[PDB]
Amino acid sequence: RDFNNLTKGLCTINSWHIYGKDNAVRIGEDSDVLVTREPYVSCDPDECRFYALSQGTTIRGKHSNGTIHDRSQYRALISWPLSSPPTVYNSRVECIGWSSTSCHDGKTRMSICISGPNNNASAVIWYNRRPVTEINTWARNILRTQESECVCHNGVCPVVFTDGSATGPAETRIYYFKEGKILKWEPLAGTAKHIEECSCYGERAEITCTCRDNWQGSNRPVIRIDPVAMTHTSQYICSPVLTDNPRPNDPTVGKCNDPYPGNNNNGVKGFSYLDGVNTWLGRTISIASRSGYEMLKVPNALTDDKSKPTQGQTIVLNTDWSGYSGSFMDYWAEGECYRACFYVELIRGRPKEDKVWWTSNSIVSMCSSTEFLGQWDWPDGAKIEYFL
Amino acid sequence: RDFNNLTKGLCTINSWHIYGKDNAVRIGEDSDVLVTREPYVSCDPDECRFYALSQGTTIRGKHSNGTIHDRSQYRALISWPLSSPPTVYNSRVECIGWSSTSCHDGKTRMSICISGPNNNASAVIWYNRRPVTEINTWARNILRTQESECVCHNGVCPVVFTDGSATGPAETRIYYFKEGKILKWEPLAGTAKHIEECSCYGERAEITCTCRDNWQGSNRPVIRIDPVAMTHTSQYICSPVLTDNPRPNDPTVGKCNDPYPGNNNNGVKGFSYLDGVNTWLGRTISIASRSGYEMLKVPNALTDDKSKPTQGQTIVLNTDWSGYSGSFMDYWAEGECYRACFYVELIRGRPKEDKVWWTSNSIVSMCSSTEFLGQWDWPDGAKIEYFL
Amino acid sequence: RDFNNLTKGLCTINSWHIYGKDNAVRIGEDSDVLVTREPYVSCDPDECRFYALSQGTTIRGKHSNGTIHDRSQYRALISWPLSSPPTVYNSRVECIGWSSTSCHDGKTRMSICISGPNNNASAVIWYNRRPVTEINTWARNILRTQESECVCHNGVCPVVFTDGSATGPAETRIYYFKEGKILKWEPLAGTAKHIEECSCYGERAEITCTCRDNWQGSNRPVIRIDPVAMTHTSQYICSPVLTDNPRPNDPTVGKCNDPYPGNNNNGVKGFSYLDGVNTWLGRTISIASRSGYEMLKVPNALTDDKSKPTQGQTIVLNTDWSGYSGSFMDYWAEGECYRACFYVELIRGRPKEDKVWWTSNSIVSMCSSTEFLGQWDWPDGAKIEYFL
Amino acid sequence: RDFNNLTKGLCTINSWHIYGKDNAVRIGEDSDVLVTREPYVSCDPDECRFYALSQGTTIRGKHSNGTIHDRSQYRALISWPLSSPPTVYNSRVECIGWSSTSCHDGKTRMSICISGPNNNASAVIWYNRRPVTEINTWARNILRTQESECVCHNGVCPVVFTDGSATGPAETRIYYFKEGKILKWEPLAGTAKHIEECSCYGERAEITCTCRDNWQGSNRPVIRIDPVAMTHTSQYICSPVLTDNPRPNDPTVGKCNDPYPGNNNNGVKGFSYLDGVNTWLGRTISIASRSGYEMLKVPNALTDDKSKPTQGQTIVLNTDWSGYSGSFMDYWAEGECYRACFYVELIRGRPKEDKVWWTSNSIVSMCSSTEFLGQWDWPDGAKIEYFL
Ligand SMILES: *[C@@H]1O[C@H](CO)[C@@H](O[C@@H]2O[C@H](CO)[C@@H](O[C@@H]3O[C@H](CO[C@H]4O[C@H](CO[C@H]5O[C@H](CO)[C@@H](O)[C@H](O)[C@@H]5O[C@H]5O[C@H](CO)[C@@H](O)[C@H](O)[C@@H]5O)[C@@H](O)[C@H](O[C@H]5O[C@H](CO)[C@@H](O)[C@H](O)[C@@H]5O)[C@@H]4O)[C@@H](O)[C@H](O[C@H]4O[C@H](CO)[C@@H](O)[C@H](O)[C@@H]4O[C@H]4O[C@H](CO)[C@@H](O)[C@H](O)[C@@H]4O[C@H]4O[C@H](CO)[C@@H](O)[C@H](O)[C@@H]4O)[C@@H]3O)[C@H](O)[C@H]2NC(C)=O)[C@H](O)[C@H]1NC(C)=O
Ligand SMILES: *[C@@H]1O[C@H](CO)[C@@H](O[C@@H]2O[C@H](CO)[C@@H](O[C@@H]3O[C@H](CO[C@H]4O[C@H](CO[C@H]5O[C@H](CO)[C@@H](O)[C@H](O)[C@@H]5O[C@H]5O[C@H](CO)[C@@H](O)[C@H](O)[C@@H]5O)[C@@H](O)[C@H](O[C@H]5O[C@H](CO)[C@@H](O)[C@H](O)[C@@H]5O)[C@@H]4O)[C@@H](O)[C@H](O[C@H]4O[C@H](CO)[C@@H](O)[C@H](O)[C@@H]4O[C@H]4O[C@H](CO)[C@@H](O)[C@H](O)[C@@H]4O[C@H]4O[C@H](CO)[C@@H](O)[C@H](O)[C@@H]4O)[C@@H]3O)[C@H](O)[C@H]2NC(C)=O)[C@H](O)[C@H]1NC(C)=O
Ligand SMILES: *[C@@H]1O[C@H](CO)[C@@H](O[C@@H]2O[C@H](CO)[C@@H](O[C@@H]3O[C@H](CO[C@H]4O[C@H](CO[C@H]5O[C@H](CO)[C@@H](O)[C@H](O)[C@@H]5O[C@H]5O[C@H](CO)[C@@H](O)[C@H](O)[C@@H]5O)[C@@H](O)[C@H](O[C@H]5O[C@H](CO)[C@@H](O)[C@H](O)[C@@H]5O)[C@@H]4O)[C@@H](O)[C@H](O[C@H]4O[C@H](CO)[C@@H](O)[C@H](O)[C@@H]4O[C@H]4O[C@H](CO)[C@@H](O)[C@H](O)[C@@H]4O[C@H]4O[C@H](CO)[C@@H](O)[C@H](O)[C@@H]4O)[C@@H]3O)[C@H](O)[C@H]2NC(C)=O)[C@H](O)[C@H]1NC(C)=O
Ligand SMILES: *[C@@H]1O[C@H](CO)[C@@H](O[C@@H]2O[C@H](CO)[C@@H](O[C@@H]3O[C@H](CO[C@H]4O[C@H](CO[C@H]5O[C@H](CO)[C@@H](O)[C@H](O)[C@@H]5O[C@H]5O[C@H](CO)[C@@H](O)[C@H](O)[C@@H]5O)[C@@H](O)[C@H](O[C@H]5O[C@H](CO)[C@@H](O)[C@H](O)[C@@H]5O)[C@@H]4O)[C@@H](O)[C@H](O[C@H]4O[C@H](CO)[C@@H](O)[C@H](O)[C@@H]4O[C@H]4O[C@H](CO)[C@@H](O)[C@H](O)[C@@H]4O[C@H]4O[C@H](CO)[C@@H](O)[C@H](O)[C@@H]4O)[C@@H]3O)[C@H](O)[C@H]2NC(C)=O)[C@H](O)[C@H]1NC(C)=O
Ligand SMILES: CC(=O)N[C@H]1[C@H]([C@H](O)[C@H](O)CO)O[C@@](O)(C(=O)O)C[C@@H]1O
Ligand SMILES: [Ca+2]
Ligand SMILES: [Ca+2]
Ligand SMILES: [Ca+2]
Ligand SMILES: [Ca+2]
Ligand SMILES: [Ca+2]
After folding, report:
1. Contact D362/D34 with Cβ under 8 angstroms?
2. Is A353 annotated in some ligand binding site?
3. In 10 A of CB A69, how many CB atoms?
4. C-beta atoms surrounding C130 within 10 Å
5. What is the DSSP string of B100-154?
6. Strand B92-96's sheet: what is its strand order?
7. What residues contact B4, with CB distance under 8 A and at least 6 apart?
8. Cβ neighbours of C240 (radius 10 Å)
9. In whole angstroms, what is the distance from residue B262 CA to residue B272 CA?
């Protein structure tokens, strides 16, 4: 095997087709399904799999009480077969911790998990299923990373980390790994003022990451990385189609180089594909909560501070719960272009459904089509009443 | 690996032997077995597996209530090892949707799943476990396909789809796929007046499909496809041994080029092997409901409008529930001829057993023998009372 | 791979060591373990596995009621990893039916399952996981076979079948298979008067089978097969150490060429290793029921009508339930000799423990040592009270 | 594959990072997790796995009552994927018995299990998943071995066994195996007065084992083995940082050549890495019970009778239960040095938590880092009240 190179451009996105769906909460009402959150999808050269952070309990288990909490000693990054649920019996643990990323470089997979108390966390970087490198907290305040896949080019796999405040300036670093070893790291540069939970994809030897400005911005920060020079830039999506949550209503003109205000100290992980007129943004439908999910075609969103939608697709109705969302692609597929894909975490339980004592999720995932396909909506599908 | 070619004729069918049986409803009374319907069997060069459409819940799970319904966002095509049950832990998802087909071409497998609302459905064609092509609804009325395996010849895998009314003329198309890409499609031609749910097999570079005329016919339509020319014909089975369900009693003379009347707007998926004097038809025993199942040797059924049985074999007694049935063969077996096989879906629960709130099935499957073997009957075997 | 040849003699048996044990009934009190009976062990070149006839239900499932019965449409030959229990999720179905044998020839595995009603049963012979040959009942009275592994030599795998009465003369046939095809069959010859359930092993190009004379004999019939000439002989074990069950007390002098009387129309599957002074016989301890199990070293048991034990080993105390027992060896092990092995079926439930409504078993298995090892006893270990 | 040689030295240990954690008791509150004890970790060239002695029941099963007991016919050495729990469906049985060790030699794995009554136990040595050698009890008093991995060098895998009293002199033997065959054995020599449960690692063609002196010592005996000469030495860790449990308080000066007194007839399995200034000792925090766990950097502990800690890391708080601990390394990792690893058994249930009737454990495991990483504590995490 050779290292994968990002040689292709994105396919033209004219609609989105169903790729995967695990129905995990429905199925786990009466089977041994682990409680999860922060899911994602990532491909190897011969298989694509679902990933998430386990909570170290089943959803029917008594230890599901308290799983609203984000960080414990009982979390782990797990992966499992595409569209199956994350079960006790089919989930493979990648590493232990409560914040993660993972990617395949064409030869083997790198997985990173962060664990520890808030003031003393550490990342362990695994390569070929073995621990290789460790990184201690630099700011002593919840070292944390993408919660979706990284992207590699000729063996170099950049990863975005943040350590520091969620409600003011923090210390974001871009690490450049190869075979699980640190080649270089850089502090964040550019005009993004706060970065968390980057969702990345690669095309034509460039990696684009759409992130969460938790502190101030309802527009999303974007980091663009050259994995050969090992350098990057940052800005915000210019468009007035605002894509964080909660957020204010959409204005007429956005902000390219600073956070669009109205909502402070909160957000959600999300994504975009930024490719000129072939630009699609994901967002929750609700401006107030993680409710609904839609894709909007917003030509030149990155650069055009007045850009509005020209097409769209509903993914989850606004009468259903959504959650985090992120990007991935099958960099080992056949053909001339990389097909954009994404997932949406469908959060069930706390805090919005507080008649149960747990929080979990299922996954839905879609990829682009060059056809203009009909749309369905894809809810989680479980009935909370059954769990009482 | 090279593409498989249909070089062999059918073996002489002198009786049927047990091939597989999963006992899924019995076992799922106390284990984590998914609710299914629309099962089938399909072989790869190194393994044969059971396939079906999951309902995204276990049979003991509370989400089994409502599973009489055919189309939801919680269905998927799954496969699992021959004669095991479809469990949460052993079922591999092929694709997401509520109508399917799948076949191996000798190199890898193509799987197709249709999803969407009734007026906006779409097919996704997967090849080598990746999405390759998408097809939007052409008639905006439940785009739908075979619900059993397709057949390939030198890489060309024809598939029959219908979109449109179930109770009047519809728009049937034969697509010719290779490596998941569309080579060609044609509209239905010939004298079949309505087509659904084709059950296909191949021999000597020809593919024969026995289908369901839901609208008018109690005889079954037959499509015969040349996968080299990429052309086809259609007619009905001429015999007065009528094989849809519900149906009128058997007459003395059938119809070759139009639907045999008496029953409108209903049917069941079924199959035949049409090979001159080596012709065998499957049918339910009951003329009123999906009850019992038998094979009848009906020499020249396709062409002889007075042909009656010369031999038979009971598969399921008329005091047991049956369901869909379909054809498959192991095109990678040893020997000089292809051995005909079939399966029967053994439907349990609603609507016939309405003391439970679910609908599911098990599978029995048989293949031909050149011996004249003794016969048993093969019921599902579960007791509904245990589920109350 | 080449076909395995029986080139080695037996290792010297000076005691027996623990090989495998599945604890299936203990574990299945609270996990999804299939109800079984008629287990055995058989090796492939790279793995050894447990085999048995499933009853198509879990032991906690409501469908376990009635599993005392031997023949239903819900039985199948399953295999699973050595010392694991037969679970819904790890059991591989080999074929469907209610009497079986299986063996590897060095290239691939042959498995045979018989199904049908008592007057119309048929065997299907699978090779390389595909059906190849079928055999109809010849006497219309419960066609039946070994219930433990067959043995192959240069691709020729003999199998012993019986069809006919269990309580008078029957029609026993030795079939010689190669690649699942019938080379030849012969009727039983020699002085054995009734044959069932042969337990076989091979050494130095000869196959020895120790069987059950259900009709009259409390000594066991022995068939010795030359798999090159495809011929056989039969007699009884001469020794007065009687090894069927139920049986009369041991006499002073046995019978070499006729059944030792005292018990009619019953028996149990059992085994021996018949190798001159290196001869070991298995038996239940009780003369009345399937209770206890012991190995006895009985020099020249086959030929010496006064031979008595010179050494022994208790396997199951007479205060614990036993069951069928049979022979197998790992013909692909390293070294200069074949190590004798056996298993004992530990039957729990009906008819001896009738406070439960099921019948099932676990497995213990041992192989020979050239050391004189200390002995333990190996009960099933489950508590029936837990199942009430 | 070639046999692995111990060519590397230990990496510099500046802290410990999380490697694996199975959360088995939390998860097994509502899934089919086997009851275990005496766990460990061991690597093959392509995978690392968790190992333990099953009790042949699930933790929710009724047969979990009585699992405080150490030796039964229902125990087996099982292995399962790293950080998954030991489930009925994913656990591979290595061999049957109630004391074990296992190691890979670079070509394949040797596993040893001891079974029998206390006065008549025997070891079976498996190689390449087949039984090869057997060893009878030499002292007729609970033949027993390491309960963690062995270590091999050029195919020679030494193993430490003890037979005899737990409360006076016993008969310890070092066996040197190759391909499961005995090359040599030696009686214990040196100044260790009692040996049990050795925890071993290899570096630079030497194997170091840290053991348990059950009879008298609260310092730990150390055996150092030359696997080429097949010879060994023994002494005690000289340091006054005492590492058995229970134990007296730490003195100022330890004992190098005799047991440090204060506690008789008890102990716990533990470990150390003894490498000059790169020396780290594990111990329980409590001096009275298996409570808490810490690593202490104790330069020259082996040789310096006044050596005190210079650094440490808490692994399990003293308000959480611990248990056995042992060493392992991935001898097939990339890089220039072997990274020290260890596990801690987190015992739950009896005797310390006697509101339940079972005893089981989970696993946490860590490996060394050359960074100075922040520390977390890693409890089992289950709530006993949930099991009542
Ligand atoms: C079967 O399946 C089919 C496939 O899925 C399905 O078809 C699909 O239907 C859906 C639903 O209708 C379509 O999705 C929608 O797409 C809209 C875009 O398309 C419309 O607009 C474009 C653009 O039009 C402007 O520009 C062009 C040129 O650039 C001009 O030609 C126009 O005249 C117009 O110009 C004006 O506007 C510009 C600025 O925007 C100015 O520059 C200009 O000067 C003028 O002012 C048209 O080109 C489209 O026409 C074409 O397509 C239609 C078919 O859809 C044909 O009939 C037609 O002939 C053409 O071919 C079309 O008119 C999206 O706008 C829309 O998304 C908004 O609405 C949804 C709710 O429905 C919101 O959830 C979403 O967030 C978007 O609205 C919010 O955000 C905007 C942006 O800020 C706000 O303005 C708005 O108020 C709203 O904000 C509020 O909500 C937010 C969210 O909660 C909140 O955050 C805010 O704060 C605020 O509260 C939606 O995506 C989809 O594209 C169809 N797909 C296809 C392929 O057809 C079909 O229906 C199915 N069949 C059945 C039977 O079910
Ligand atoms: C152990 O296992 C064994 C192996 O399984 C098992 O043996 C098997 O037994 C079963 C059961 O008996 C057999 O299965 C049946 O087979 C019948 C066919 O065989 C009979 O008929 C043929 C043909 O005979 C005609 O033709 C030949 C030449 O072509 C002539 O020689 C004849 O004289 C006769 O000619 C007349 O008819 C023609 C028109 O049909 C005219 O052309 C002609 O001019 C004359 O009028 C014979 O050859 C057979 O004989 C041979 O075999 C028997 C053994 O079976 C030997 O004894 C004998 O010596 C020969 O060797 C034989 O006589 C099928 O017809 C039958 O299926 C019908 O019945 C079942 C119910 O039992 C129905 O469910 C089924 O649907 C069929 O009936 C329906 O449909 C027909 C067609 O339209 C209707 O006419 C009929 O009324 C009925 O309709 C009703 O029900 C329908 C369904 O609900 C409904 O839809 C309708 O609307 C309506 O309500 C059945 O399959 C099997 O073949 C045996 N197998 C073998 C290998 O032997 C054995 O028993 C087991 N042992 C034990 C102990 O259990
Ligand atoms: C730790 O683990 C150790 C390893 O497991 C363990 O040691 C093992 O102990 C067990 C239990 O003791 C041993 O197993 C028993 O072995 C007996 C055989 O060994 C004895 O006999 C031989 C043979 O002796 C004759 O022959 C030699 C020469 O051939 C002569 O030298 C003798 O003098 C004698 O000659 C007479 O008999 C001949 C006819 O039989 C005539 O030819 C002759 O002219 C004379 O009349 C001896 O060689 C043995 O000695 C050697 O070994 C002992 C150690 O055991 C040493 O002390 C000694 O120094 C020697 O080295 C030894 O004496 C088996 O007979 C025995 O099995 C019977 O009993 C059990 C019950 O215990 C029954 O269940 C079983 O079925 C057998 O009895 C039934 O069947 C016989 C046969 O028909 C009947 O005769 C009998 O009445 C009985 O029938 C009844 O029950 C049946 C079953 O229910 C029923 O069907 C009938 O109808 C009827 O009701 C048993 O297997 C084992 O071998 C030891 N292993 C080793 C390696 O030592 C050790 O104890 C453990 N430690 C601890 C602390 O626990
Ligand atoms: C984020 O994560 C960080 C990384 O984990 C974390 O930092 C870590 O913090 C922990 C906790 O503080 C550290 O772990 C402790 O480490 C101690 C060792 O370090 C101290 O000591 C050394 C050595 O000092 C002597 O020697 C040097 C030279 O050799 C001299 O320079 C010194 O002056 C001194 O000399 C005296 O002593 C010698 C004899 O011992 C004589 O030779 C000499 O003549 C003098 O008398 C120092 O070098 C260290 O300083 C350096 O590090 C600190 C940071 O820790 C810096 O601030 C500093 O500037 C330096 O760089 C440091 O002072 C361990 O001793 C300690 O373990 C004991 O305590 C714990 C309880 O806390 C016990 O559980 C444990 O068992 C040990 O105590 C028991 O055992 C000893 C030995 O017998 C007994 O003496 C003692 O009484 C006690 O016994 C009792 O309990 C036993 C257990 O129950 C029982 O069995 C007994 O019977 C009895 O009842 C502990 O491991 C860790 O190393 C830090 N890691 C790092 C990298 O910094 C950080 O806090 C986290 N952040 C936050 C915000 O949470
Ligand atoms: C497991 C068990 O209880 N076995 C006992 C059996 C059975 O109770 C009956 O044989 C059942 O009918 O009875 C014995 O007398 C016997 O046969 O030797 C004693 C033996 O201990
Ligand atoms: Ca369960
Ligand atoms: Ca924000
Ligand atoms: Ca019809
Ligand atoms: Ca008998
Ligand atoms: Ca001690």
Report:
1. no
2. no
3. 12
4. 18
5. EEEEE-SSSEEEEEEES-TTS-EEEEEETTEEEEEEE-SSSS--B--SS----BT
6. B34-43, B48-58, B76-81, B92-96
7. B45, B104, B105, B106, B152, B153, B154, B331, B332
8. 21
9. 21
> How many Cβ atoms from other residues are within 10 Å of residue C183's Cβ?
15
Cβ distance D61 to C374 less than 8 Å, yes or no, reads no
Pairwise CB contact (< 8 Å): A134 & D31 = no
How many Å apart are CA B111 and CA B42, to the nearest integer?
11
What are the beta bridge partners of residue D266? none
Q: Strand C76-81 to strand C48-58: parallel, antiparallel, or no bridges (unpaired)?
A: antiparallel
Short-list C118, C229, C97, CA closest to C176: C229
Domains of chain A plus CATH, in order, are 1-388 (2.120.10.10)
Residue C338 DSSP code: B
- Tell me A27's DSSP state: H
Which value in Å is the resolution of this experimental model? 1.3
Cα D127 to Cα D113: distance, rounded to the nearest angstrom: 12
Gaps (C–N > 2.5 Å) in chain B: which residues precede them?
none
Q: What is the DSSP letter of B4?
A: -
| Helix, coil or strand: residue A175 | strand
Q: Kindly tell me the sign of the dihedral angle through the C-alpha atoms of A222, A228, A230, A231.
A: negative
Side-chain half-sphere CA neighbours of D189 within 13 A: 8
Q: Who among B32, B62, B131 is closest to A367 (CB)?
A: B131
State phi, psi for A145 to the nearest 5 degrees. -140, -155
H or E segment and range at residue B28: helix B24-28
Burial of residue A186 (number of CB atoms within 10 Å: 0-12, 13-18, 19+): middle
Strand partners, A76: A54, A96
**Torsion-angle region of D56 (φ positive above 0: left; ψ -120 to 50: alpha; else: beta):** left
- CB contact burial B142-179 (16+ within 10 A = b; e otherwise): bbbbbbbbbbbbbbbbbbbbbbbbbeeebbbbbbbbbb
Provide the 3-class DSSP secondary structure of residue C69. coil
Chain B residues with CB within 8 Å of chain A CB = 32, 34, 56-58, 60-63, 72-74, 76, 88-89, 91-93, 95-97, 113, 115-117, 119-122, 124, 128-132, 134-137, 179
Instruction: Please tell me the distance from the alpha carbon of residue B38 to that of residue B346, in angstroms, as a whole number.
Output: 10
Q: Which helix (H) or strand (E) element contains residue D28?
A: helix D24-28
C-alpha D294/C-alpha D377 separation (Å) is 10
Contact D78, D126 (CB under 8 A): no
Taking any CB pair shorter than 8 Å as contact, residues of chain C touching chain D are: 17-21, 23, 26-27, 29-33, 47-48, 81-85, 87, 89-90, 330, 333-335, 339, 367, 369-379, 381-383, 386
* CA D152 – CA D127 distance, rounded (Å): 13
Task: Write out the two tokens for D125.
Answer: 């040595």
Residue A378 CA to residue A376 CA, distance in Å, equals 7
Of D366, D295, D357, D353, give the one whose Cα is nearest residue D321: D353
C326's CB contacts (< 8 A; 6+ apart) are C40, C41, C146, C147, C148, C149, C199, C269, C270, C271, C342, C343
8 A C-beta contact, residue C81 and residue D92:
yes
Residue-wise DSSP of D74-86: T-EEEEEETTS--
Q: Name the residue facing A369 among B34, B96, B134 (closest C-beta).
A: B134
Residues C278-295 as b/e (b if ≥16 CB within 10 A, e otherwise) read bbbbbbbbbbebbbbbbb
User: How far does the centroid of ligand 2 lie from the alpha carbon of residue B284, in Å?
Assistant: 16
Q: How many CB atoms lie within 10 A of CB D310?
A: 11
Inter-residue long-range contacts of C382-385, CB under 8 Å, 24+ positions, other chains counted = C382/C25, C382/C26, C382/C29, C382/C348, C382/D63, C383/D62, C383/D63, C384/C348, C384/C349, C384/C353, C384/C355, C384/C356
Give the integer Cα–Cα distance in Å for C59 and C88. 11
Whether a cis peptide bond, with omega within 30° of 0, leads into C81 is no
